[PDB]
Every structure is written in structure tokens, then in C-alpha cells.
Structure 1
Amino acid sequence: IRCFITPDITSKDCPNGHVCYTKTWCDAFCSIRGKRVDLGCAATCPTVKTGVDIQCCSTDNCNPFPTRKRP
């Protein structure tokens, strides 16, 4: 599967993963900027720590930057 991977901006091939993921969380700047976001690919929908939020898909290239940083 091909997912967008942070920090790169072009879609990467990931032969061993099955989902595309977006992870968003807030810093002191949440309101003025938006959520911080980390884009990747995984074998499985990854585990969240309290306060971080995750989005998982399994369509090629389905993890582009969210806008607000979740939506």
C-alpha cells in the first residue's frame, strides 16, 4: 500500500503495511495553527496514547494532510 509518509510529500510504497494512518494531537498552539500531525503506513491501525487521535484507512494514498488537522 501507498500511503503519504511524514515528512515527505510524495506517496511512498510500503510492501509490508496494510493501513495508511494520520495521528493528530495538540500543542499550546492548537487554536492559531491546528493539530500537529504525523502521517505514516502500518501493518495495523496503531495504538493511541491519551490525547492523540488516529485515523486509519486501507485505500492507496488515503492519508493526505487533514484540514484543521483531523477533519
Structure 2
Amino acid sequence: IRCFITPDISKDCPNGHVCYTKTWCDAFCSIRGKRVDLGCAATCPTVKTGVDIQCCSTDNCNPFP
């Protein structure tokens, strides 16, 4: 599967991996917008309160928002 991997923004990841888009606010949220992390992992990563992750299973499915 092909995923975007920041800060490259496209890589070939092993079949079975998912692409992901993590977004969340840090203290600069009103100054620079949300933090954005694009990558791929063998399973959808776990995160915490305040972090949005979208995991998807098709090529290039996690472009920069």
C-alpha cells in the first residue's frame, strides 16, 4: 500500500499496513493550525484524548488535509 509519510508528502508500505492521518492541537493551534502526522503502520495506531486518527487501506488515502 502507498501512504504519505510526513514530511515527505509517498512511500510503499508492506501489504497489510494501513495509512494514517493524525491531527491534534498543540499550543500553537491558533497560530499555525493543528499538528499533522501522516504515516503507515501494520495496525491503526492508538492515540489519546484530543488526537484524531483516520486509518485507511487504499493507496494514497492519507493526503495532507
| Cα distance, 1:44 vs structure 2 | 1.0
| Cα distance, 1:17 vs structure 2 | 4.5
| Cα distance, 1:28 vs structure 2 | 1.8
CA separation in 2, counterparts of 1:39 and 1:17? 17
In the alignment, does 2:52 pair up with 1:62?
no
Which structure shows the higher helix fraction? 2
TM-score (norm 2): 0.85
| Cα distance, 1:23 vs structure 2 | 0.6
| Cα distance, 1:6 vs structure 2 | 0.9
| Cα distance, 1:63 vs structure 2 | 0.6
Count of aligned pairs between the two proteins: 65
RMSD: 1.5
Q: Which segments of 5 or more consecutive residues in structure 1 lack a partner in the other structure?
A: 66-70
Q: Which segments of 5 or more consecutive residues in structure 2 lack a partner in the other structure?
A: none
Identity, % of aligned pairs?
100
TM-score (norm 1): 0.79
